[PDB]
C-alpha cells in the first residue's frame, strides 16, 4: 500500500483545506507531489483521489491533461526551454546547442544521474528576454554557453 | 522572503499609472504601496454604493485588457441583474505568445491588482474572489500569496472590511501548463478541479459560471485600472488617451526591436510610434517586414500607421507587438504559430482537434520541402476549416494569422511551393 510521507501529507492537507471545496486543490496537490518526488508516481494518484474525494479516473484524466505534470521521468531539475515564436527568432537553437555541450542531452532526455531533464515548452511570457528558460521555478534569459554554465553550476 | 528568479523585463511609461511602481523591476510591498496613497481608492469605494462603482467603470470606457476589449462596466451590469451569490475571477493565465504585460503588475505591484479585485468584488456583490495564475508564473504565485496576507494584516480583506459590512476572501489557484485554461469557461472548469475544457456559450459566466453562479472574469490589466477610475473619477480617467478608448494600456514589445519590454502608453499611439518612438526602432535598423499581434493577427509594413485601440481599424488584441524584420522567413514564423495551436487545442471539437494538428503537420512538410501537391492543397483547406463547430476562440482563430501571411506575403509562400 503506497502512503504519503507525513511531511508531504501535511502540505497536501493544507491545500485541500485552503479552498472552499476539496476538489479545487487538485492542481496545487499535484504540483506538491511533483515537487517532492521529481515526477508524479502513478501509485500516488489513488491516495490523492481519496484525500480529494474524487474518482481515480478523474485524477488520472487531470494528470494526463496538464502538460507540467510528468508520470514518466524522475528529474531533480526541469530545464524548461521555450520553443515558441519569439525565442525561436532570438535563438532557442543556440540555447539548446549550449545545453547539449554542457549536459550532453537533447529536449525530452534526462542526464544519466537523473539531475536535469530538458522540457520543451510553449511561450513562457518573458519574450522581451528571449531566448527564455526555467530551472524548476527560476527563470532566465540565455546570453551564452559561459553564462548558462555559471547558472547551472548553482543547481547541485 | 526570497522569490524564484524572474528576468528583469524593461518597463517604460508616459502616464505613470499602472507602471508608477512596476517600472522598477522588484516587489513593491504594502508599506511602499500605502506611501503612494494605495488602498485609499478602496476606502472611497466602500463609501459608494456598488451600483455607483459600476456606473463609474461603465462611464470610464474601460474595455477588457485580456484582448477581446469587451466593455467592463457592461459585463458587471449583466452579472448583477442575476441573483447571487456571485463570484469575481482575476484571469492571470497570460500565455499568448509575446504577451508579458500582466506579469509585471503581479510580480512588481501586486497590491494594485489586489485593491482592484476588492473594489470589483464589492461592485458586483462577490464575497469570494479567485486569482487563476498560470503554473509557469511560480514567483507571481508566491508574491500574490504574500501580498494577500499583507492586505489581511492591514484589514483590507476578511470579514466587515473597514466597518463596511463587506466580506471578501481571495483564493490563489495555479494552472499546470494549458493555454486553454485562460479561456474564461475552461478557467472556471479548472477552478472546479476538472480538465480545462471550454463550455458552450451562451451562457456567459455572468449568467452561469463557477458552480453555475453569476461569475465575472476580468484580466489582470483590466482590474489594475479600477483603483485609478475610483481615485481620479471616471471624468478625469477619460482625459487619458482618446475619449472613446480611454485610460493607460500596456504594450509588450518583443523580437527585432532595440528596447524590447512593456510600454504604458495611451491607445491613440500608432503601431509605428510603439516600434520607432518608444521601443528604439529595429535591430540593425533593418526594415519591418511584419508585426505578429501575439498568435492572433499579422500586420504588414503597410499597416504601421493604425492606432493601438479597440476600434474596427485599430491594432486591438492584447497590444502584443512581435516585430519581424526583412531577413525573417514568414513561413518559418507561420510554422511556429501552427506548432503553438497544435500543442494547445483541448480536442473537444473535431475540426479544431484535427485541424490544429494537420495545419502544423502539413506546414512542417511544406517548410522542409517534403510536401506533395496534395499536402499543399490539404494545408490550404485545413487552414480554412479549423473554425467550424468550434465552441471557443482558439478554434475560431487557429488559422487566422497564418491566412493573413498567405494573403500579405504570397511571394514568400510561392518560393516554398517550388
Ligand atoms: N492575454 C492572453 O495571454 C491571452 C489572450 N487571449 C485573447 O482572448 C480573446 C478572445 O477571448 P473570448 O473570451 O473568446 O472573447 P469574447 O469576445 O467572446 O468575450 C470577451 C468577454 O466578454 C464577455 N461577453 C461577450 N459577449 C457577451 C455577452 N453577450 N454577454 C455577456 N458577456 C459577454 C465574455 O464572457 C468575455 O468575458 C482574443 O481576442 C485574444 O486576444 C487569448 C489567449 C491568451
Ligand atoms: C484560448 C483562449 C485563451 C485565453 N487566455 C487568456 C489569458 O491568459 N488571460 C486573459 O485575461 N484572457 C484570456 N482569454 C480571454 C478570456 O476568455 C476573457 O475574454 C477575458 O479573461 C475577460 O477579461 P477582460 O474582459 O478583462 O479582457 C483567453 C481566451 C481564449 C479563447
Ligand atoms: S475550439 Fe478547440 S480549444 Fe476551443 S473547445 Fe473546441 S476543441 Fe477545445
Ligand atoms: S516566445 Fe519564448 S517566452 Fe514567449
Ligand atoms: Na520593499
Ligand atoms: Na516581472
Residue numbers in the entry:
A (entry chain A): 5 to 160
B (entry chain B): 2 to 419
Provide the publication's sentences verbatim.
Complex I couples the transfer of two electrons from NADH to ubiquinone (Q) with the translocation of four protons across the membrane. The L-shaped complex is structured into a peripheral arm that protrudes into the aqueous milieu and catalyzes electron transfer with one FMN and 8–10 iron–sulfur ([Fe–S]) clusters, and a membrane arm embedded in the lipid bilayer that mediates proton translocation. We have determined structures of the electron-input module of complex I from the hyperthermophilic bacterium Aquifex aeolicus, encompassing subunits NuoE and NuoF that contain the FMN cofactor, the [4Fe–4S] cluster N3, and the [2Fe–2S] cluster N1a, respectively, both in the air-oxidized and dithionite-reduced states at resolutions up to 1.8 Å.
We therefore sought to lock the peptide bond in place by exchanging a nearby residue, G129E, with serine and aspartate, respectively. The longer side chains were intended to occupy the position of the bound water molecule that has to make way for the flipping peptide bond according to our structures. Thus, while both mutations fixed the position of the peptide bond, the Gly/Asp exchange seemed to exert a much stronger effect than the Gly/Ser mutation. Thus, fixing the flip of the peptide bond of E95F leads to a slower dissociation of NAD+ from the enzyme further decreasing the rate of the NADH/ferricyanide oxidoreductase activity.
